[PDB]
Ligand binder design. Structure first.
Ligand SMILES: Cc1cc2nc3c(=O)[nH]c(=O)nc-3n(C[C@H](O)[C@H](O)[C@H](O)COP(=O)(O)OP(=O)(O)OC[C@H]3O[C@@H](n4cnc5c(N)ncnc54)[C@H](O)[C@@H]3O)c2cc1C
Ligand SMILES: Cc1cc2nc3c(=O)[nH]c(=O)nc-3n(C[C@H](O)[C@H](O)[C@H](O)COP(=O)(O)OP(=O)(O)OC[C@H]3O[C@@H](n4cnc5c(N)ncnc54)[C@H](O)[C@@H]3O)c2cc1C
Ligand SMILES: [Cl-]
Ligand SMILES: [Cl-]
Ligand SMILES: [Cl-]
Ligand SMILES: [Cl-]
Ligand SMILES: [Cl-]
Ligand SMILES: [Cl-]
Ligand SMILES: [Cl-]
Lengths: 111, 111
């Protein structure tokens, strides 16, 4: 029950974000497409990451969040997460398995 | 390595939000204040737990977040979380310990 260090807050935040995207509507209205985009932009301005190698502010303004659909948003967030993985020497996550991981459970039934 | 259940998603999101508030500026600009207000508003529309989001939307529309300062916002978020605690039968968190819990660590160097 101590303050989150970078690693712990990261783990909290990916879990929240990927779950957010997993339950985002398959067919979002324009207003929802715009709320989610805006949400991700505001997130980029406030996420605590002092002296982080990933400049997420700049990253979110260059490769803008694609909030057209659940799968678009899901895949965009997965690519973002993989950019952070690369800088940190963590292996690439296979983005095609994003639903198994965060919504449905691995096909092997272990969830 | 499996999808978040309601309890897991919850633990991660609070950690993320209290930490977000803990690193919010002491004297934020009018634009930061408005951004954070909007962030929370959109959050309440999209939080993946359906029952949970309808619940917090109605609590947030009742008392909008005070994003005036790190203190106001952190405390506001503490009070919001204590409402969910009460509904769920969990103990009250002493909001005077919030800075210690999510920012500075316990005054006794326990962290
Ligand atoms: C926006 C953001 C920026 C960050 N920037 C930095 C930084 O610059 N420097 C730094 O040191 N730390 C940064 N962090 C924290 C860091 O990314 C990790 O969270 C932390 O290092 C813990 O790593 P981990 O090995 O526990 O797994 P995490 O990266 O936290 O991943 C947790 C789980 O998500 C799943 N996962 C992994 N990759 C993907 C993917 N591509 N798509 C979907 N699911 C995936 C895996 O199952 C993994 O176990 C950042 C975190 C966030 C949210
Ligand atoms: C916005 C939101 C709405 C939710 N709505 C529901 C719902 O309607 N129904 C439901 O069943 N679950 C809901 N949840 C999930 C639920 O609140 C808990 O997260 C979950 O039950 C796990 O609780 P926990 O005992 O592990 O501790 P959590 O409540 O998840 O808290 C995690 C840690 O935060 C610290 N903490 C506790 N209270 C405070 C506080 N008030 N201020 C600062 N720090 C604190 C404590 O150290 C605690 O160990 C919601 C979660 C969120 C984020
Ligand atoms: Cl509009
Ligand atoms: Cl809107
Ligand atoms: Cl922005
Ligand atoms: Cl901006
Ligand atoms: Cl910006
Ligand atoms: Cl911008
Ligand atoms: Cl977890």
């Amino acid at each position: 029950d101590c303050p989150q260090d970078r690693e712990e807050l990261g783990r909290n935040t990916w879990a929240f974000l990927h779950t957010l995207a997993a339950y985002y509507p398959d067919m979002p209205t324009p207003e929802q497409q715009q709320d989610m985009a805006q949400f991700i932009h505001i997130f980029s301005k406030f996420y605590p990451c002092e002296e982080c190698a990933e400049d997420i502010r700049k990253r979110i303004d260059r490769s803008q969040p694609d909030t057209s659909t659940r799968v678009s948003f899901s895949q965009w967030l997965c690519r973002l997460h993989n950019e952070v993985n690369r800088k940190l020497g963590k292996p690439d996550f296979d983005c095609s398995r994003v639903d198994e991981r965060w919504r449905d459970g691995w096909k092997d039934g272990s969830c």
